[PDB]
């Protein structure tokens with residue numbers, strides 16, 4: 332689990348969005364596994380606007396942060412799950428690192444701010460949904 336809180340927005344994995352996220356919906360995209368809802372309180376986080384390909388992510392299944400090198404946002408085939416049929420997920424960045432079911436939502440950060448959130452895993456890999464292109468999160 333986990334979310335990004337920036338301005339009056341809350342960014343979560345679309346497959347983990349709550350009834351309240353959907354009732355306050357701003358934008359969602361199944362192909363990216365992202366959903367953004369509106370909040371009444373002002374959020375804590377800063378979004379990176381950069382092309383970093385190294386950073387640090389939080390892994391809840393180990394209660395620890397790990398440094399990672401990750402691929403540029405791209406279209407990657409993701410196997411069927413209880414949440415989605417087998418499909419290509421866009422704007423996804425892969426890295427070698429630990430991730431289990433339950434780790435989705437962990438934040439990936441570089442020196443410029445938040446880069447994205449854990450969205451895929453297994454096989455000693457961890458995939459992150461990029462948010463750096465969502466320029467409207469800041470205005």
Ligand SMILES: CN1c2ccccc2C[C@@H]1C(=O)N1CCC[C@H](C(N)=O)C1
Pocket residue numbers: 346364409412414415420430431432433434435450451452453454
């Ligand atoms: C975190 N993952 C994981 C880790 C170890 C072992 C098995 C898994 C599966 C899970 C996974 O990749 N998912 C499931 C939930 C929806 C995600 C999506 N963006 O489509 C895909």
Ligand SMILES: [Zn+2]
Pocket residue numbers: 379380381382383441442443444
């Ligand atoms: Zn950066």
